[PDB]
Design an enzyme around this catalytic site. Sequence first.
Site, short mmCIF file in Angstrom:
data_model
loop_
_atom_site.label_atom_id
_atom_site.label_comp_id
_atom_site.label_asym_id
_atom_site.label_seq_id
_atom_site.Cartn_x
_atom_site.Cartn_y
_atom_site.Cartn_z
N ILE A 38 1.22 52.46 -43.23
CA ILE A 38 2.38 51.61 -43.43
C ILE A 38 2.72 51.46 -44.91
O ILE A 38 3.82 51.00 -45.24
CB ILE A 38 2.17 50.24 -42.76
CG1 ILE A 38 3.51 49.62 -42.38
CG2 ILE A 38 1.38 49.32 -43.68
CD1 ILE A 38 4.38 50.48 -41.51
N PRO A 85 -7.02 48.10 -45.71
CA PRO A 85 -6.68 49.35 -46.41
C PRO A 85 -5.19 49.68 -46.41
O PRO A 85 -4.72 50.29 -47.37
CB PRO A 85 -7.49 50.41 -45.65
CG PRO A 85 -7.94 49.75 -44.38
CD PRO A 85 -8.07 48.30 -44.70
N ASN A 89 -15.66 44.11 -40.18
CA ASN A 89 -14.86 44.85 -39.22
C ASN A 89 -14.95 46.35 -39.50
O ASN A 89 -15.75 46.81 -40.32
CB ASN A 89 -13.42 44.35 -39.24
CG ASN A 89 -12.70 44.69 -40.53
OD1 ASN A 89 -13.24 44.49 -41.62
ND2 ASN A 89 -11.48 45.19 -40.41
N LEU A 90 -14.12 47.13 -38.80
CA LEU A 90 -14.13 48.57 -38.96
C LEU A 90 -13.66 49.00 -40.35
O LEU A 90 -14.05 50.08 -40.81
CB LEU A 90 -13.25 49.21 -37.88
CG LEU A 90 -13.00 50.72 -37.89
CD1 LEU A 90 -14.27 51.49 -37.57
CD2 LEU A 90 -11.89 51.08 -36.92
N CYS A 91 -12.85 48.19 -41.02
CA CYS A 91 -12.41 48.47 -42.37
C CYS A 91 -13.16 47.65 -43.41
O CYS A 91 -12.83 47.73 -44.60
CB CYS A 91 -10.90 48.23 -42.50
SG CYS A 91 -9.91 49.04 -41.23
N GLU A 117 -13.26 44.51 -44.30
CA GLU A 117 -12.54 43.49 -45.06
C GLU A 117 -12.45 42.15 -44.33
O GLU A 117 -12.11 41.15 -44.97
CB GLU A 117 -11.13 43.97 -45.43
CG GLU A 117 -9.99 43.40 -44.60
CD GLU A 117 -9.81 44.10 -43.28
OE1 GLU A 117 -10.39 45.20 -43.11
OE2 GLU A 117 -9.09 43.57 -42.41
#
Lengths: 683, 683, 289, 289
Positions: B579, B575, B375-377, B379
């Site tokens: 939050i 990540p 994915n974009l991160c 993970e």
Amino acid sequence: VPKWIQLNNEIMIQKDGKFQFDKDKEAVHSYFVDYINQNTVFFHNLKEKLDYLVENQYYEEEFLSLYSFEDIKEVFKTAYAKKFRFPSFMSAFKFYNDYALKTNDKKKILERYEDRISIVALFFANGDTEKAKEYVNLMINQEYQPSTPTFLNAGRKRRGELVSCFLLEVNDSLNDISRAIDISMQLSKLGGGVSLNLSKLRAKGEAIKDVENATKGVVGVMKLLDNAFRYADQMGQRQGSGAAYLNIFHRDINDFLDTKKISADEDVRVKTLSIGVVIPDKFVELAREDKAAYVFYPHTIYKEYGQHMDEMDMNEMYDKFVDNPRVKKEKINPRKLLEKLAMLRSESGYPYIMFQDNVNKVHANNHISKVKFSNLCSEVLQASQVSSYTDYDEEDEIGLDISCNLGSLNILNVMEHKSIEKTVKLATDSLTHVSETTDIRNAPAVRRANKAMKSIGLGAMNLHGYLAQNGIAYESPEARDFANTFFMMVNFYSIQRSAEIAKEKGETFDQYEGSTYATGEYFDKYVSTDFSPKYEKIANLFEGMHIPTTEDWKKLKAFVAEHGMYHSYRLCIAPTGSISYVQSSTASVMPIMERIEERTYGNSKTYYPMPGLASNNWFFYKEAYDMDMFKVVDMIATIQQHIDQGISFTLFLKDTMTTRDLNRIDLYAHHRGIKTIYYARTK
Amino acid sequence: VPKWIQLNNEIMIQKDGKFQFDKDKEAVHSYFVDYINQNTVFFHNLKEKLDYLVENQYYEEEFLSLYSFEDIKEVFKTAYAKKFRFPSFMSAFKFYNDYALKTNDKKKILERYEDRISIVALFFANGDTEKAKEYVNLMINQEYQPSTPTFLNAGRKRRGELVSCFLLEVNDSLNDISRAIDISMQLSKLGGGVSLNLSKLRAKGEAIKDVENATKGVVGVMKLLDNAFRYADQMGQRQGSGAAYLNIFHRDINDFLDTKKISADEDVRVKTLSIGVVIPDKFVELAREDKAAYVFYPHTIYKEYGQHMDEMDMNEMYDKFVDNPRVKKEKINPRKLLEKLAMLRSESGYPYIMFQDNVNKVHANNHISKVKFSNLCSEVLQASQVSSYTDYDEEDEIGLDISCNLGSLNILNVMEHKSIEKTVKLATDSLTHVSETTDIRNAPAVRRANKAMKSIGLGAMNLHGYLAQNGIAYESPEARDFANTFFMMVNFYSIQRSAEIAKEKGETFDQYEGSTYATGEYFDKYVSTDFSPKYEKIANLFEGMHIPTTEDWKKLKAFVAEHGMYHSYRLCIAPTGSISYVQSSTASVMPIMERIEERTYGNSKTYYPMPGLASNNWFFYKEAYDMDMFKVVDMIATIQQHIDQGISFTLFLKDTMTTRDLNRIDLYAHHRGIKTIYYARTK
Amino acid sequence: DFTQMFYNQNVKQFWLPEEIALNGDLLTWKYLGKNEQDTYMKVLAGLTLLDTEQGNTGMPIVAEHVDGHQRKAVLNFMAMMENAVHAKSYSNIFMTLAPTETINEVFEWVKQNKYLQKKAQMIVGLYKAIQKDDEISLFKAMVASVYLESFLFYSGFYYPLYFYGQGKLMQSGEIINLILRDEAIHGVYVGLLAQEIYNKQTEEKKAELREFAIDLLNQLYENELEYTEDLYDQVGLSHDVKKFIRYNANKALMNLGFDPYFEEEDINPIVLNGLKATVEPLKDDDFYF
Amino acid sequence: DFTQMFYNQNVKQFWLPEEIALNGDLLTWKYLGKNEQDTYMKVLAGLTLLDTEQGNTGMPIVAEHVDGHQRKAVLNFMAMMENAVHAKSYSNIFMTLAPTETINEVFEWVKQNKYLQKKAQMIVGLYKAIQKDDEISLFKAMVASVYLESFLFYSGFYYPLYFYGQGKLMQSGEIINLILRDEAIHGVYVGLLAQEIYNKQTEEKKAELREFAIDLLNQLYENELEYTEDLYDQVGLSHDVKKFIRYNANKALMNLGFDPYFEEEDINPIVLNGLKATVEPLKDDDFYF
Ligand SMILES: Nc1ncnc2c1ncn2[C@@H]1O[C@H](COP(=O)(O)OP(=O)(O)OP(=O)(O)O)[C@@H](O)[C@H]1O
Ligand SMILES: Nc1ncnc2c1ncn2[C@@H]1O[C@H](COP(=O)(O)OP(=O)(O)OP(=O)(O)O)[C@@H](O)[C@H]1O
Ligand SMILES: Cc1cn([C@H]2C[C@H](O)[C@@H](COP(=O)(O)OP(=O)(O)OP(=O)(O)O)O2)c(=O)[nH]c1=O
Ligand SMILES: [Mg+2]
Ligand SMILES: [Mg+2]
Ligand SMILES: [Mn+2]
Ligand SMILES: [Mn+2]
Ligand SMILES: [Mn+2]
Ligand SMILES: [Mn+2]
């Protein structure tokens, strides 16, 4: 340097103070004695040639299977019996470099001119050997020329679509924008030029789901479309060409225009996306009276009235929009906007200008829709209905997306054969066949509008060539008289053929009953005004041909009332870029840009004189830039009064004239009833 | 400057040579006694507040209608009974600036922390008052934190989607490319980060129906996706973020990488689309042996074998690709490609590195599909099946596009409450609810994969915070022992909850029977190896909690065999960027970048100390850049052995070290079993 | 890491005075009061005089002492823009708006003006103090140059931008906007060259160079406040001009890699409307652990 | 009487190498012998060196010492052309036609070539010998500059022109013709400035200045002969190039107001063959017809 190229460059070498035009003919001979015949694949008989072309996936089996081999051989023999010879080197060079079928290795020539013409005729006739021979006689006499898509791809298995002008309506939604991008990519893949209407899209700073200042405007959509057209570039053969049209009362109109400024940043400028501006009569009235105008936010108008801004008549809606507090608008100076349009056209030739009311005051299908935008060449002017492309697993509301069928009459060849009626009717039949055989499975609205409207575009070319070879100046009143008479006959026979096809097939185009053809309004100016030539010279030019009178037009009106009309649109004058070379004709109804044009192919120079150019008609072949643009506008309006769609009308300007002169030409075009203005080419 | 801003800046003003950390607490008090309490909107009781939020289109009324108002009042009272206080100014500031609900004009605060937690809990429970109270206690104790989409948007009318990341498979066709662009725009409109696998797209210079050297490669699709993500930018609030993943054996892999070079031309450079590279073990083996490698043309492989290049194992098919003359390939130096990867990551932090074999050697759902991209991160590592988006009026073959819901355990709060089991089970239930109530109407493969896979992502935060606040060095073997035990417990209880949900619903995820969960292979290392702490300090840290042994794992394996698993994927460590501020936790399982971070907001500057930073634990809060990346790799591998999906592993590098050091870190990560590497951030 | 990129941006911004027709400004110029016309003339002369120093000395002196062929080329291009484009543009604006005698008098006045002279001579003094092969003196001159490009011009630019944002003097305002856009990139570029020198220094030397930069900024800023009141009190704008000076001072500091000195302020909306890690080959045995 | 017209001519001649696409030369380059490619690379490298120093040093230093803002603007513009346009264009050509190693090697070759180093030493030495307010040292440097512009470039220009005239390497040749068009006007302009200084002298001083100019020309000429033989013997053209440089030496002398020094010769005829819109507002009468 090849021998034919030397013989062609010998034209500029002046003997006795005159250009050696006849040397060009010799060049053609060389081009055929040294190159074409050597690299042309020959077969023992036509049966072997057809078998080799079909088996090697050059041709299609379906269209050839409709005829016996004897009929195909007879059609080919009819094509070759003319003994057609290209009169200029550039004609043969353009045909054998652009249209002649070549092997997969692109080193041998499989198709001659007669072979290509015979194949296109057999495709047109759809199984009728006599009709195929009629088409062969039409194209080998060079009276009619199918467009570059049709001429190049007819009968070929490895081909794009036969239609290359597509007009798309984009609705104000992300789903519709993505679908428009997809359809543009699919149609550019097919080899077609795609025009998209962006007026329904809400401007920059509008609300998306009631969150403010969220919309990117039409400029982001233009960036997306420009990327899509760059990506879809005919499998890396030609640069992907697209057009975007915006109404001048759309608020993004400045940013729209700012996409064509040289000073625009990389995130603003679109390079492969042509732009056109739709100018209603209200904008011209506001500029004329110097009253400050308002550019409106389309989504606020849609929320207030339930209809898009470009879907209603701005002449009666502008005051209500301005006085409506719930309609958001921005103050602009219409004269400043006109000056900006003129400056942008001087710099880059953009945008195309569409005079909405000039189009729609003679539009026959306003009941279906008003013409909101034009094509990439700014000559297709048809009713279009936007489509509502919903989410996935939800039924879309398919509208009408314009895709007309191009084909051009050669005015010189048509009139010297005294065959306006036969050529127009045969061209209409061929255009109908190509429209019926077009099936696009990735453009739903284009396919639906092709099935329903059955719209074709029958154009004309070699107008200036014909006038110059007949001792008539393009700006003379005699030239306009000839254009009036010739195009009135073209319109008459096109309407007659459309009504005959409707009677034969028993069907008209969808929503014909609401058209002005059905009500007889279209024929009003034809049943009251006589369009016979007012000059004796033009009448002698039309000698041997029956010129339809007011009684003939009344009979045609009654025939259309009884039987209907098969085509929603019949006539549109396309630029005719490269087919004018093969036909040895001047491009479109435009005046010639140069008497002799110099081109560079590879590392070699070549010289193309205008067809029929000599010492006697050198003065009559006046260059377009030297001409008065007001008289060119007058001629184009004279032609446009007999053309249901628009005419690709390029302005030809000198570097001396300023933006005031360009604006004056545009305003005179608007005054004279010009529907579209294509380009502002500065010399 | 505000009073709380001055109090927060007073931290860095040292007193007696020590930072004034306690001043931070004062700041929060000021921030509440001067800004939050004055800017909050108070009602007479909870009924008026709920009614105002419902009628004013702030809250969805459906989820609140499942409870009587007495139950909602009890849930809110449970939330407020904890008397939760933000220990740092930045926690409250981040919540009330990014997550607290404000009015339409954003002038007042409608939601407190307790109000937001109560609303999220009521949405999670779906009509269960006791479950809502359990969620309230879980979130107010800050043991569990729903992802930013879920925490911010749960129960809101103007909400987006609760799913953070989406992964799309793009098939090698224009229809599929256009559909991928459309779905990317739709999902970026929904607010989620979109990742697209471009490995199936044929490389530059491939044939589109027998015309060769026609494709633009993955770079043209990259430009299209970049423009699509630029256009769909969350209504202009958050920049549209996309990721493109390409296999390292793709021929375009260099051009792919050239999209991120700082010297790239504008026609190649892509700036809003992150890039990731999927490296099979074959590439690392070739680079290790210094044997010249071959990148492949995907379309030739698909033509020869009928399957895509990334659809099969390169470790067993690379030699067949190389020896096959019908497969087109280009010679590359794998060591030079690795050095290019290291240089690119040093310059810009790209590409993401996905060690495909490390992902698929422990992947539990290889039968459905191998994990081909992240994915974009970087993970999310799940099975995906490509979709066959066909022409219009043709049925599309809908595949599986990855999408999981994120949620993070606060390790410090979870272990302080001695509630690993309860927190894990409740978080699994909340993520299952988020998956169940997610329905995306414009991404069909995403919807089908959400319905079938039922994949969720349960992450963890405050690993370094817990270790530093307990006197354990992040690089120490004791820290890795703690991570091993804690994440084995998390995996055990996540599997137990998944099996319990499958039992209570009578349904498993699609194709569970072929998974390693069904065959019992997944539990092998858990039924033979004991993951109890090897150090007395860690065992004391785990006191009061039943650490699962091999017998408990055998019982869980039998339970899974009997009942199955509801979720194909359960654990993924995101990540957790912003939050983590609200939870007073260090970001994810990564080590802290800095002890005190100086962030500029408006015209003011604020300092956020790491949670629990003080004099006694100053050196236990070692900065990530000062740490040995090999020991961080060891920690991430220790955690990864218990995580079924990946971990967003950011590399923290010093400016002094070379690209060879980065390559060594990457190769050690591959050796240690690291699945993905997120970023190369250089100090 | 940056010179070729700046080369590209500089050359693609090339323009000439002749491109903007100036005569249509007379249609709004005639409607301004005497104080407005006076302030405009004085501001314009101030900008002209400062920009001449930059063309004759500032850019050429920096080009002379900077090492690197590509940097010298970019710097030459910038010097060309000052002398060939900007200077002609300012002259054109003047000749359009005032008769010859009025131009000569305004330049006589501004040439004698205490606040204009103070800043002009402070900057020129630092350019004259550059010593061959001394990077410290070069850095000090670069700081002076950045302060001129990114800060000192802006008390002047304010007024044309103020008119431009109102629809007044649009032709000359367009010219000024193009000039300002060039000075912005000049300031950023010279700033990067100064940071390169700064980063080669010890920690003590860095602290000393920071003190130099802040001290210089303070001297120039206090004179700018006086310059501002002297010109803008008569048209009631000084408060807003002062905010614009501080905002641009902060940009100049950021160009030099320094923190902002002044608190963030909003700017007049009318003026707003006008406005490589070391590559080391893999040595094998890096694949084994 | 002339600066304004030179200013206008220089700015109207402005160009960038990127305006010319170079990929069209790829095939005619591929087809040349190794000897021809070697000579071509080296020739352009020698030109690059000359323009590097003319842009970095020669034009800026002359600009510094010549009085008058307009004269300085012309000289500054010419300086920019030398290093920002001309010197850079050669790299555009190199990057198109040659692999990086061949490019690296040719730049190493300029550093070690004794004739190229000698000519740079001599020309740059004279530039750096200019003394403020000393018109004689300035004259000497202007003579050196004219000899660089109108004589020294021509041993290099010969070869691109020789190919252009045969229809080979025509895109590179187009760039070179633009460079040559610029140098011709640069040589005339600097020549006129040199004549200004010469005309101020006594007859005795003039006689010495002619001696200086002729001695310098002969010294440069003798070095250029050796350079020419070194480059052109391998392509068989040395004698032809020598005739060309003598032809251009006479043009340089003429630019300085001196009589031709070499006798006329027939030059290779191949080489001889190698040689916004105005805006008006809309009136209310333009809307009616
Ligand atoms: N101007 C031309 N246009 C088209 N084809 C030409 C032209 N000139 C020559 N050709 C081709 O070359 C052939 C040779 O023509 P030529 O002028 O030598 O005499 P011919 O009597 O027409 O010859 P043939 O026996 O081929 O009919 C023609 O048949 C034709 O195929
Ligand atoms: N750190 C904090 N985190 C969250 N809310 C806070 C914080 N500090 C103050 N508040 C809010 O502001 C109010 C101010 O009250 P304060 O904390 O000073 O004590 P109080 O008046 O004695 O009452 P109590 O502590 O029992 O709420 C709190 O009741 C709470 O609602
Ligand atoms: C149409 C088009 C395709 N492509 C590339 C991207 C797609 O991944 C790839 C497949 O296109 P397709 O849509 O599959 O084209 P096709 O089905 O007509 O051809 P084929 O039978 O060989 O599949 O071609 C381009 O690069 N540019 C284009 O304009
Ligand atoms: Mg909508
Ligand atoms: Mg396909
Ligand atoms: Mn300047
Ligand atoms: Mn400047
Ligand atoms: Mn030069
Ligand atoms: Mn020169």
